[PDB]
Design a protein around this ligand. Sequence first.
Ligand SMILES: *[C@@H]1O[C@H](CO)[C@@H](O)[C@H](O)[C@H]1NC(C)=O
Ligand SMILES: *[C@@H]1O[C@H](CO)[C@@H](O)[C@H](O)[C@H]1NC(C)=O
Ligand SMILES: *[C@@H]1O[C@H](CO)[C@@H](O)[C@H](O)[C@H]1NC(C)=O
Ligand SMILES: *[C@@H]1O[C@H](CO)[C@@H](O)[C@H](O)[C@H]1NC(C)=O
Ligand SMILES: *[C@@H]1O[C@H](CO)[C@@H](O)[C@H](O)[C@H]1NC(C)=O
Ligand SMILES: *[C@@H]1O[C@H](CO)[C@@H](O)[C@H](O)[C@H]1NC(C)=O
Ligand SMILES: *[C@@H]1O[C@H](CO)[C@@H](O)[C@H](O)[C@H]1NC(C)=O
Ligand SMILES: *[C@@H]1O[C@H](CO)[C@@H](O)[C@H](O)[C@H]1NC(C)=O
Ligand SMILES: *[C@@H]1O[C@H](CO)[C@@H](O)[C@H](O)[C@H]1NC(C)=O
Ligand SMILES: *[C@@H]1O[C@H](CO)[C@@H](O)[C@H](O)[C@H]1NC(C)=O
Ligand SMILES: *[C@@H]1O[C@H](CO)[C@@H](O)[C@H](O)[C@H]1NC(C)=O
Ligand SMILES: *[C@@H]1O[C@H](CO)[C@@H](O)[C@H](O)[C@H]1NC(C)=O
Lengths: 50, 420, 198, 84
Amino acid sequence: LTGTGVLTESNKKFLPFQQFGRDIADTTDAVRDPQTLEILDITPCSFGGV
Amino acid sequence: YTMSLGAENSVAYSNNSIAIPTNFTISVTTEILPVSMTKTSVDCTMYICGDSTECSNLLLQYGSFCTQLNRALTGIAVEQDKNTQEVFAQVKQIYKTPPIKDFGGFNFSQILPDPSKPSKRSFIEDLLFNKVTLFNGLTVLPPLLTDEMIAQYTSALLAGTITSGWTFGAGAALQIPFPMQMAYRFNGIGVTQNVLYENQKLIANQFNSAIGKIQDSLSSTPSPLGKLQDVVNQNAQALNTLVKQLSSNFGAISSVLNDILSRLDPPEAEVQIDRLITGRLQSLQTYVTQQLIRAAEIRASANLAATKMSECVLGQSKRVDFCGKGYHLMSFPQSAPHGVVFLHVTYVPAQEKNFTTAPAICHDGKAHFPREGVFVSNGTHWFVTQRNFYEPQIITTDNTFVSGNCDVVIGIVNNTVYDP
Amino acid sequence: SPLGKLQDVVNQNAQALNTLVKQLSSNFGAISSVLNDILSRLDPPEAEVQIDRLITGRLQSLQTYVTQQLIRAAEIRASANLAATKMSECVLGQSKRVDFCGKGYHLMSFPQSAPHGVVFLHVTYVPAQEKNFTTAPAICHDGKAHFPREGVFVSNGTHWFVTQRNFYEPQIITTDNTFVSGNCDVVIGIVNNTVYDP
Amino acid sequence: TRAGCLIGAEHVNNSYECDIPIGAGICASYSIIAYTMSLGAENSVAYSNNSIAIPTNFTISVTTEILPVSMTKTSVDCTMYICG
Ligand SMILES: *[C@@H]1O[C@H](CO)[C@@H](O)[C@H](O)[C@H]1NC(C)=O
Ligand SMILES: *[C@@H]1O[C@H](CO)[C@@H](O)[C@H](O)[C@H]1NC(C)=O
Ligand SMILES: *[C@@H]1O[C@H](CO)[C@@H](O)[C@H](O)[C@H]1NC(C)=O
Ligand SMILES: *[C@@H]1O[C@H](CO)[C@@H](O)[C@H](O)[C@H]1NC(C)=O
Ligand SMILES: *[C@@H]1O[C@H](CO)[C@@H](O)[C@H](O)[C@H]1NC(C)=O
Ligand SMILES: *[C@@H]1O[C@H](CO)[C@@H](O)[C@H](O)[C@H]1NC(C)=O
Ligand SMILES: *[C@@H]1O[C@H](CO)[C@@H](O)[C@H](O)[C@H]1NC(C)=O
Ligand SMILES: *[C@@H]1O[C@H](CO)[C@@H](O)[C@H](O)[C@H]1NC(C)=O
Ligand SMILES: *[C@@H]1O[C@H](CO)[C@@H](O)[C@H](O)[C@H]1NC(C)=O
Ligand SMILES: *[C@@H]1O[C@H](CO)[C@@H](O)[C@H](O)[C@H]1NC(C)=O
Ligand SMILES: *[C@@H]1O[C@H](CO)[C@@H](O)[C@H](O)[C@H]1NC(C)=O
Ligand SMILES: *[C@@H]1O[C@H](CO)[C@@H](O)[C@H](O)[C@H]1NC(C)=O
């Protein structure tokens, strides 16, 4: 699963068999790191208009 | 079943008969009007391509559609700001209610701001705000006017209304006793000031009860803010369908550009990219066009709201049913999350009574007509009263005028005209 | 910057036309943006394919221009309907609608032409030089309450008068400009004063 | 600010009828200063049960209102434009 963004610690709890998560509109929000079986929150880095 | 249009009644029409109300009800009606919608700007390049230089390279050769869509959305957002400013920013001075709230027993503590400081909002504004409940190139621009300033504008308008009447909308605010303001408004709807000055306690009680009923309806009854909810839902649905359309292949092997580039040779891979470009650009244009149409509709609604505020909050309107069912008395504005709420105070006649009527009175061989009123007939005697309230008076030359003899008027009766 | 609306409308129309003309000069992913070069350099099958893609792009751009023109036409029609209503209700008559034809009590209006619009000169009445006074709902004289026919009771500190609401023209209280509506024990705020009988 | 952040403008505590709107109640004017916009003059009317204000003079004001009526009539030959 490829993407770009900033990873951060998440307090949401995933089920054991469950790898990543999607919010409404089917956009990735959190993923479980395979090596450490750890849940990481994903937010796209800051973008906007000038 | 076949729907019933309503109660099926026949008015007791008669050649010599009239019905005049003898009592009244002060009704307060709630009207919800959308004013603005959320300001959304979508980066066309990022949405269509997603930070891929080759996709951008082919997209730029494909036109100037990005500029067109971006300017369209920017115009929509500026128009939303203009709508909000036009509807609310009517006054040039922020008026304040005096600390001593002696309005002749009329109670406004539910619609005035409270010292509790919940964003400087009253119950009705607080009730409405509580009642309404609400990333790949799309962003939402905040409105120029915050909820706090809109509430402050509403408070200024309401304070100017109660403390000055309609003068502050046509010049400088001029203080008036509240009872005098209500009497002037009764005169506007054709009822003499005596009715208010003699039934002031009843009128104040009715007004307070109506405000309480509005508060109860807002607290308990749901689906009262459907228009604002519908507007928000439509905007959310458009955004969601746009985001979902981003996840469609449009007839290519895959919907994601990275996979296509990583598995396919440049010629057909670029062909697939081009078909995705066509599909996504067309979907974006469809979204922009629907947003433009919705913006036009919202602008029409905002113009209507501004007209209502100017003609009913800053003044008294003689237009029928423009600001509530009944003879319009006063109006009060209240803020809403993306709109305005008008509390229309109106006068409704009640407790009618049948009375006989004559076009004129033949006295001394000449015909007498009421100056402004109606020659009702009691069994005992004929009386002259006002059309909208039963206040019988002895027929006199003071309140009647002569227009010749009594051989040309059809339905004239013979009665004495008292001379003082 | 006093005629921004007309200038904005003209600018929007010009911008739409210019962007349409510029869009004509885009290849839309083909070899070239000009048909003559494509025909003169390419075999009929792919040349016609490129022509077809230009057809799709240009036709879609034209439809976008037409749709935006339709929306602008609807907005302009709304503005024109408002202008016609203003002309009928303020030029051909006097309007009691507040703020419909200017800030203040509307008196009369004058129309003027504009390159793609109309200009209304609204003549209005604005009160000024206000003064404070002490008022009363009614006057209790001879045990009966008197109310103004059309006006207000004011006192110049010591002497009560009756004047019109929108201009200070004090007059002696008289039965000519007041009417009686019973006794003076029910009106809240009533005072004692003499009602001159002529 | 709630609309983002400003670089090159310094925030001031005073409030004026602002000129360049930025968003979220913050807007800038002319050095470039950023502040919360002031809604207008802040006054309280002298309300009393027995006090009125009556004008003793008047002003005849003339106001200008601009309204668009029509736009340029443009017709585009679809066939000639698309093909040439
Ligand atoms: C799991 O369910 C319980 C009970 O509803 C809830 O309190 C808890 O927050 C849930 N865990 C997560 C991660 O949502
Ligand atoms: C490898 O994965 C296991 C989970 O089975 C974990 O306990 C261990 O710390 C991981 N080692 C790493 C990340 O070096
Ligand atoms: C008029 O109707 C209201 C309804 O609430 C009532 O309270 C009031 O007493 C009535 N007045 C008369 C004179 O019957
Ligand atoms: C208005 O109603 C509130 C209800 O809590 C009451 O506290 C307040 O005294 C009332 N004001 C008047 C003037 O009746
Ligand atoms: C007038 O009389 C008719 C016939 O009796 C009756 O139906 C109607 O309700 C009466 N109206 C009033 C106001 O009393
Ligand atoms: C009619 O008018 C007289 C005189 O005002 C009054 O005494 C009487 O009660 C009224 N009603 C009837 C039914 O006569
Ligand atoms: C009113 O209408 C009735 C209906 O029959 C008629 O008898 C009567 O003469 C008319 N009265 C007038 C016109 O005064
Ligand atoms: C009114 O009086 C005149 C003159 O006495 C008479 O001719 C006429 O018939 C009378 N009308 C009625 C309705 O009594
Ligand atoms: C008030 O009006 C009376 C006229 O009734 C006048 O004589 C008097 O000078 C005025 N001024 C004062 C201070 O009473
Ligand atoms: C204002 O209140 C006082 C008593 O507090 C009263 O005497 C006076 O008449 C009131 N003003 C009016 C215009 O009623
Ligand atoms: C007006 O004068 C009479 C004189 O008897 C008095 O009884 C009444 O109370 C006076 N009214 C007021 C409002 O002072
Ligand atoms: C009213 O105001 C105008 C302002 O132009 C002035 O010229 C005029 O003299 C004033 N009239 C009075 C009576 O003060």
